[PDB]
Amino acid sequence: MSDQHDERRRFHRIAFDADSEILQGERRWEVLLHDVSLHGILVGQPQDWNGDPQRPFEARLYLGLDVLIRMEISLAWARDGLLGFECQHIDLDSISHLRRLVELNLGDEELLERELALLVSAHDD
């Protein structure tokens, strides 16, 4: 249709204003999303929980009350407050929302096609 639509630039980075809850059935930990992809997700926790890669975690992204993104993940590595999870089961409809949002903003699906070790926070040292 057209690119020029916003005064700003649509997020060309994977970080949305969504309620990100990483839970495990009974235990909920609200967290801030830094970048999420098809291979994994990097969040930032200013509070350390248990920290066990043997414990699979649930990533529930409330993009809206009616717009729920869901994905079953496992803790791959936790380091310096940055926790990189590996994706196990992202729901088809969930992916449909995620990819559609990227498409909508024209953020390039390239971001989803990196490797978890390549996914760093907005600030790099």
Contact 48, 36 (CB under 8 A): no
Q: Is 11 annotated as a binding residue?
A: yes
Token look-up 């949305």 returns 16
Experimental method: NMR
Query: In sequence order, what are the beta bridge partners of 43?
Result: 33, 83
As a whole number of angstroms, the distance between CA 35 and CA 124 comes to 13
6 marked as binding residue? yes
Record the tokens describing residue 15, joined without a space. Answer: 């970080």
Residue ranges making up the domain that contains 112: 1-125
Annotation-wise, does 17 bind a ligand? no
Residue 55 is assigned to a ligand binding site: no
Give the closest residue to 46 by CA, choosing from 26, 62, 60, 32. 32
Kindly state the tokens that stand for 97: 């929302």
Distance CA 94, CA 96 (A): 5
Whole-number Å distance between alpha carbons of 54 and 92: 25
Please give the tally of structural domains in the chain: 1
Question: How would you classify residue 106: left for phi > 0, otherwise alpha for psi between -120 and 50, otherwise beta?
Answer: left
- CATH number, residue 32: 2.40.10.220
